[PDB]
Amino acid sequence: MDKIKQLFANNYSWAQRMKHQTPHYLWIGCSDSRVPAEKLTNLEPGELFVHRNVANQVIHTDFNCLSVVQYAVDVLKIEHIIICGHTNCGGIHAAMADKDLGLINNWLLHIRDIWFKHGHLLGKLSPEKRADMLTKINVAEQVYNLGRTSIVKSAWERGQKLSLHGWVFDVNDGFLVDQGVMATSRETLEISYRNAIARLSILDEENIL
Amino acid sequence: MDKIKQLFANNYSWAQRMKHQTPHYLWIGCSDSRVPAEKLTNLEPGELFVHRNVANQVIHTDFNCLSVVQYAVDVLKIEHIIICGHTNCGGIHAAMADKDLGLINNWLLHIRDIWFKHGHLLGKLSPEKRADMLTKINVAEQVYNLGRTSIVKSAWERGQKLSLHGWVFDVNDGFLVDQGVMATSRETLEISYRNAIARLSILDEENIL
Amino acid sequence: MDKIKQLFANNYSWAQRMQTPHYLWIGCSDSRVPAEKLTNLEPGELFVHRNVANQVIHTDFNCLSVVQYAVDVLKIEHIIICGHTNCGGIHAAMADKDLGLINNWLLHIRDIWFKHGHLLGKLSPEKRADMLTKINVAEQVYNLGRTSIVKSAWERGQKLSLHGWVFDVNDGFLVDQGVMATSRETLEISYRNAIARLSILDEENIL
Amino acid sequence: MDKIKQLFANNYSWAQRMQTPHYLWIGCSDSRVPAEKLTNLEPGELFVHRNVANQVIHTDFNCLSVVQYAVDVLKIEHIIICGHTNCGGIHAAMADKDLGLINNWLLHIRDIWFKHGHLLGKLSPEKRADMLTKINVAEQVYNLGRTSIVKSAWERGQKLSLHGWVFDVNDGFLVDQGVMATSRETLEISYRNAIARLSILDEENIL
Ligand SMILES: [Zn+2]
Ligand SMILES: [Zn+2]
Ligand SMILES: [Zn+2]
Ligand SMILES: [Zn+2]
């Protein structure tokens, strides 16, 4: 409408004012996330192969995300896969609310499972800070999910060089923050994941219930 | 590695050099696509809610994409959904090749079905230009797929304002090109889709077999 | 109520009164007579997936992972897709009603309908559903034969044969629909022959 | 070969020698005795989905659309999830082997295993699979009760009851696993009671 017309005009102004690339990372981010990964990481266009979904998930049986991972790893020979969460995540907030929002809630049930898996931790935390912790923990679980896929396990098994990263983008300072799960093998995945969960579980004393 | 370290340094330099938003569009683009939609459309961060998958598909039964559409429409009350293809699409090229690339090929079978659906047209075209035409036709079919979802049909049925757009981004000039399918109702979807296919089917005489 | 209490009774009475699988069977959730009774097979002979309108959707993780497990792990050499007459899913896909989530699943059947719309448009309205049911089976064997899983099994020399039949409640006989693949070449040939044959209408069927 | 030719023979001989559905049945593809025989029901009483390890995955379009169609369209008031003993999918999920694509499907079972790892770690190794099979059924009824489809049916006042049983080949009896929901509150209560009960081990089961 007025909005579609302003989009076309903005595209035209941009194109006029401006006047092959091997991808080296697969980027899995969130549909809410507001700043684009290419801006954020200030890399040259085409360096990132990008999948975005709600709450940056790697669901075991999601054909969309799984096929993107298989194509990146087996076909494009991409050596780095990055899961990037972000602060003030609508998806995560959506997952925590009581509301039945319809079909999307079925997608967010995987986050709710991650909530209950870490319920003891999240339950010793004051209610108002749980959404920040869950965003962090979710990134860690998605890297773990990624490292458990048949695709990633097979790539590692045949000696293909492949690393998995889990970061959170904080808009309040523009920095990427490593959540500590970083895998180059099934063994490093296990140790790194367990270490990260343990580190995340040390709560700041001023919000312990 | 050297690449992850340069990413962190680039993020830091960017953040230091730099020193709430209602989304109004759902953007469905392609994982290959190299220029980001926010750059391309020069809109302010947070205006776009973004899903990217390989070859910018709306597959009937894709829970990932369908749930993003349902959340955008029913929850975020987004009034515009845009499917954006792009020139030199790896996904489309991947779909046309003979190679069994593995799991991803199952995802690209939907494009191959779109190929055979328009085979007569694509077969009267010289082989070397078919990938450009298929990229265009695919955008048109995905808008059609989108307008046929239970989610979109129900939104229109209850009088919710919602428009569907199908564009192609051409990097060779930076312009967004309307492929002509634009729906605000099931009826406009049908007419617009049929019109677009018919228009796309008029071939340039110098590459007719 | 009584309903569930009755099942436990009927079961307890049934049990009181009373194996390598070699086929993967993909049938329909509205099917009413089991494949095991239908085929009079020994229990455990069949590894069974049932879904609405006996579909092999390109990107259905549920059915694909069933296929992969049957083929790569169980080493099954026969995959049978069975449609049937008076199929509720096929009739649901042909109706114009918004049924909700299921309509998205049934859009794949509607694409097939469109694909063979000329064939179908020259048929009597009361015959069209049974024709779409037959075409559906052919199209799903075709989909199955086009999976990376099946193609990769053939490439590597594994013995695997795909079948597409329709069970008719009326007379209780399975009728072969003619798409039978032991390879990608035989898939293509038999799919195309199956459809070409379905396109030869008897005047009883013609509108 | 003879195999397929034999099926048509066995079928032709079977047919020569020889209904509103009220339940949605979610069973396992490795199940061997059909639900219809098992329950001694009339043909067409059961609307059947079978998949590997009788799962209701949150985001499985295949099973969810089956559920939605059963509930919103067919108006079925009972959804029965049936696991069984000697389940090949459960055993496959417990093994450490890369089976390929199917392993991704089975990771959901492995998450459940982890969820109840303490309960399971105190069990005899030869008993663990049958315990995971029982827990699986409870967890899937729970998943089913948490779908937007089922929750929305309850919200709006529709009569719908969820059940979770295990069929034992040994003695042929269905055994109720105790998670039975007619509402979200009764889901929570009965799920928690089911698991609490499963956590009371008999010394025969204890390692
Ligand atoms: Zn987010
Ligand atoms: Zn592309
Ligand atoms: Zn049927
Ligand atoms: Zn089983």
In chain C, domain spans = 1-207
Contacts of C59 in chain A (CB under 8 A): 63-64, 67
Strands A163-170 and A175-183: antiparallel
CA-based nearest residue to B175, from A2, A38, A16, A39: A16
Most B-contacting residue of C66, C148, C184 (CB-CB within 10 A), to test interface: C148
Residue A118 in marked binding region: no
For residue D89 the two structure tokens come to 């999918």
**Closest ligand, as measured to the CA of A85:** 1
Are residues C41 and D13, on separate chains, in Cβ contact within 8 Å?
A: no
Tell me the C-alpha to C-alpha distance, in Å, between residue A120 and each of A115, A196, B10, B68: 9, 16, 38, 30
Resolution of this entry, Å? 2.3
Instruction: Check if the beta carbon of residue D29 is closer than 8 Å to that of residue C47.
Output: yes
Contacts of D171 in chain C (CB under 8 A): 15
Q: After which residues is chain B broken (C to N over 2.5 A)?
A: 19
Of A11, A54, A62, the CB nearest to B41: A11
Domain range D1-207, its CATH number among 3.90.230.10, 3.40.1050.10, 3.50.50.60, 3.40.1790.10: 3.40.1050.10
Q: How far is D74 from chain B (nearest CA, A)?
A: 18
Among chain C residues, the shortest Cα distance to D36 is held by: C34
Instruction: Check if the beta carbon of residue A104 is closer than 8 Å to that of residue B71.
Output: yes
Among chain A residues, the shortest Cα distance to D60 is held by: A61
Identify the experimental approach. Answer: X-ray
Q: How far is D108 from chain A (nearest CA, A)?
A: 7
Instruction: Check if the beta carbon of residue B183 is closer than 8 Å to that of residue B171.
Output: no
Among chain B residues, the shortest Cα distance to C68 is held by: B103
Are residues C148 and B103, on separate chains, in Cβ contact within 8 Å?
A: yes
CA-based nearest residue to B69, from A104, C159, D71: A104
List helix spans (H) across B71-185. 90-96, 103-117, 119-123, 130-147, 150-157
Q: Is C119 exposed, middle or buried (0-12, 13-18, 19+ CB in 10 A)?
A: middle
Rounded to the nearest 10 degrees, the angle between the axes of helix A130-147 and helix A150-157 is: 50
* Ligand 1 centroid, distance to C85 Cα (angstroms): 47
Phi, psi of C148 (to 5 degrees): -55, -35
* Ligand 4 centroid, distance to C66 Cα (angstroms): 12
CA-based nearest residue to D139, from D194, D66, D197: D194
Nearest-angstrom CA–CA distance, D150 and D183: 9
List helix spans (H) across C40-101. 61-68, 88-94
Tell me the C-alpha to C-alpha distance, in Å, between residue D140 and each of B55, B68, C28, D61: 34, 25, 22, 15
* Ligand 1 centroid, distance to A91 Cα (angstroms): 5
For chains A and C, CB pairs below 8 A equal 12
What three-state secondary structure class fits D159? Answer: coil
Contacts of A66 in chain C (CB under 8 A): 61
CA-based nearest residue to D148, from D65, D24, D26: D65
Beta strands in B16-89 (DSSP E): 25-30, 48-53, 80-86
Instruction: Check if the beta carbon of residue B109 is closer than 8 Å to that of residue B59.
Output: no
DSSP letter, residue D170:
T
* Ligand 3 centroid, distance to C83 Cα (angstroms): 7
Residues 43-82 of chain C whose Cβ lies under 8 A from any Cβ of chain B? 57-60, 64
For residue C128 the two structure tokens come to 């069209």
C-alpha dihedral (D57, D59, D60, D66), degrees to nearest 10 = 90
Contacts of A62 in chain B (CB under 8 A): 63-64
Q: B1-209, which class in CATH?
A: alpha beta
CA-based nearest residue to B55, from B17, B19, B108, B5: B108
Tell me the C-alpha to C-alpha distance, in Å, between residue B44 and each of A34, B36, B37: 9, 13, 11
* Ligand 3 centroid, distance to D35 Cα (angstroms): 17
**Closest ligand, as measured to the CA of D31:** 4
Instruction: Check if the beta carbon of residue C129 is closer than 8 Å to that of residue C90.
Output: yes
CA-based nearest residue to B68, from A138, A28, D68, A91: A91
Nearest-angstrom CA–CA distance, A171 and A168: 10
Are residues D78 and C3, on separate chains, in Cβ contact within 8 Å?
A: yes
Radius of gyration of chain D (CA): 18
3-state DSSP of chain A: CHHHHHHHHHHHHHHHHHCCCCCCEEEEEECCCCCCHHHHCCCCCCCEEEEEECCCCCCCCCHHHHHHHHHHHHHCCCCEEEEEEECCCHHHHHHHCCCCCCHHHHHHHHHHHHHHHCHHHHHCECHHHHHHHHHHHHHHHHHHHHHCCHHHHHHHHCCCCCEEEEEEEECCCCEEEEEEEEECCHHHHHHHHHHHHHHHCCCCHHHEC
Q: Is A98 exposed, middle or buried (0-12, 13-18, 19+ CB in 10 A)?
A: exposed
∠B87-B91-B94 over CA atoms, to 5°?
115
Contacts of A101 in chain B (CB under 8 A): 71, 74-75
Nearest-angstrom CA–CA distance, C68 and C150: 8
Which amino acid, C55?
Answer: Q
Q: How many residues does chain B have?
A: 209
Nearest-angstrom CA–CA distance, D141 and D136: 9
Are residues A107 and D58, on separate chains, in Cβ contact within 8 Å?
A: yes
Instruction: Check if the beta carbon of residue A191 is closer than 8 Å to that of residue A131.
Output: no
Nearest-angstrom CA–CA distance, A64 and B103: 10
Residue B194 neighbours by CB under 8 Å, 6+ apart = none
Instruction: Check if the beta carbon of residue B55 is closer than 8 Å to that of residue B138.
Output: yes
Chains contacting D (3+ CB pairs below 8 angstroms): A, B, C
* Ligand 3 centroid, distance to C170 Cα (angstroms): 14
Which amino acid, D193?
Answer: N
Q: Is A86 a catalytic residue?
A: yes
Rounded to the nearest 10 degrees, the angle between the axes of helix B150-157 and helix B63-70 is: 20
Chains contacting C (3+ CB pairs below 8 angstroms): A, B, D
Residue C129: count other Cβ atoms within 10 Å of its Cβ. 18
Instruction: Check if the beta carbon of residue C62 is closer than 8 Å to that of residue D51.
Output: yes
